[PDB]
Symmetry: D3
Subunit: 153 residues, 6 copies
């Protein structure tokens, strides 16, 4: 671990409600290093490709419409065990089952309007697929953050 | 759910120690909507009516004296599953058994000086009784917060 | 002074945008003492009294409409030089003229949506009338905050 | 204005020191709207275009080296009087001359490592060119933030 | 309980990464009272005496080298059940197994670079040994904090 | 400069009101480096030396009594133009004259309880003597903070 990466995304509800800074501050405070960041408007092709596992499900179109309703802030974050860690930080999928101190536990209320997305660490390879899906290799940035020498042994 | 309400109250210890803002910021950050707010001094009649279930208990008079010792900030908050949610946010009844990130876990130390009160969701109807007890219908405010359209499906 | 009081309210824009906590904090942080606090909706009649000095002016109805368009959080604060201090803290009337640090310089953009009101120290007695205007004497609370022992010589 | 736009970027010092969140917050807090956002590394060629006005000056290469020495977070913000407002918020050029409250007055120390850049309102069209310089039109997002309904008269 | 004390220490990673304030603010917010504070550079004698239980362990020298690599901020904190409470606040020993809202859960990533140390409440007497080890009796301060009368019954 | 040092202390009012963290943060935030840090009680003799310039003045004993009435947190900070920078950050002597943003403008109210002291840059050598006055050379720490690589050209 250490140069592990994950895809993380302030969803359109978090963007609208003015929580980009707050959320990025939590990942920066943590020592996680930003290596991708992009303010964008997901299109149909990308939305439907992102939720492909849910194609045949009834709720699919509503899901595409929401993630489409307004712009997102897509991120790639780097650090030891980043993928699991970001998921611990965000809370449970449902904000109403999330503990205070998690992103969703502090900022959210509804299951389907949960402010943020992070690659599932239990879906092996998910982080990579999501990253390549949202960022071209050129959009990613190789650097060394000041913090790194004091974050890791 | 969604227009569900609960009664919440910064107790005299939280008022004294300067935590009104901090606590209201946590509920505002969450998307919960304020529909009642009142800086007040509870009297005997109201204190004893509030803790009526504890009339015959030895500790009753001490409890009335504390909630009487200085002014409170009483609130009504609105949102999906508000009653349970506020209780998750505050922590356990004892601050010394509360997790960091909860109100009591971050700001409190003593069981009997726990900075805040929130209607018990497990006492069905408690929120309503507490609300009507502290606020007249005219003191409550029907509005729509900006946030609502992005907080709920 | 020491017991000087000033009328302050979070205007409906500031309320909508979820700035009540952050505002109350700035005042508690400062050592100012909350002695009145009332989440309310200004009715028309009250709104026209409050702006009575501008009644024969073109922009009068616009002012009335806005200030009544959503709930406010009306407050009373107590401390040495409270009125002037609160007006220093808020900024200039136009937030477009306000310094970073001040409430308006950090939170607002348009002269008309300047988020907050506070009694003008340069109009003697203003604090007095506006306090009386929004608050019956019995809504206000005499107490002693532990901070004062160290706030004042 | 209302839809006026300004180019802002967290310089490599500010990025290294973990100040991206805190910076984006100050702008969201303010009600400014993010309409462009790109974590990137300025290549040399871009860096020399951006500083083209200083090309025949001694300190030119130092400026190029620094601005390319690490990733930046480049942004576009939208609001009434955005450009001037952003420059008020940042401070003076020298942080050693900047007031507490301003981004530089709180976070920076040396004229050369002044943490952040923002288009100069006193050089008309500057915002326009620098925006175009860092962003292709299609990287920018037309949307409506719920805040504006209350941010603007 | 109430005048119970524990030894707490921002480790060299927390010092370097600029988290003294943030951590002290969490203990002050909590009502815990500072009665010892000291910015210092631990020497060999003290480091090896502190980790004496780990003398024969292979990892001992690396542990001494890290706690030696840069200065610490050593503290003594006072309050009811302080020793357990500080340990709840910091998280688990491993930051990657810590919940958001804990010090390590918010600020750390690596097991061996966990920003902070707090006396183990399950090692009876540990707090005292650690305190006497780092502070002479004269370096400690007997006072009464303002908060105390509202923190405890 | 770069290695210039300044003496700063949170006065007993600021200590009582739980402002040590918030103060240290403002300085870490800024990139100033803590090189001395000592929670202490000024004895009378020290207090009279520190205020020696006012010894033949009426208000002298009041000053001595106050500064010795409770613990202080005495500090030393290192950075380019540290002394002037710290005095800009604090505000004016009177907090009633201080701007929002400055430590005193946000946290204090009365000229006499102005929460914090910092060496005067307009009295050359002041920083030197006050540092020596509160700190033996060996209490101070030579180290390198990772921030400087990016804080200074």
């Amino acid at each position: 671990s250490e140069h592990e990466r994950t895809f993380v995304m302030v969803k359109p509800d978090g963007v609208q409600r003015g929580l980009i800074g707050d959320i990025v501050s939590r990942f920066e405070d943590r020592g996680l290093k930003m290596v991708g960041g992009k303010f964008m408007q997901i299109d149909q092709e990308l939305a439907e490709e992102h939720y492909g596992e849910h194609e045949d499900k009834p709720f699919f179109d509503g899901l595409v419409d929401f993630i489409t309703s307004g712009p997102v802030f897509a991120m790639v974050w780097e650090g030891q065990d980043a993928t699991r860690q970001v998921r611990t930080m965000m809370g449970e999928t449902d904000p109403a089952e999330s503990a205070p101190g998690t992103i969703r536990g502090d900022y959210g209320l509804d299951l389907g309007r949960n402010v943020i997305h992070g690659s599932d660490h239990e879906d092996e390879g998910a982080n990579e697929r999501e990253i390549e899906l949202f960022f071209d290799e050129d959009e990613l940035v190789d650097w060394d953050q000041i913090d790194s020498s004091w974050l890791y042994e």
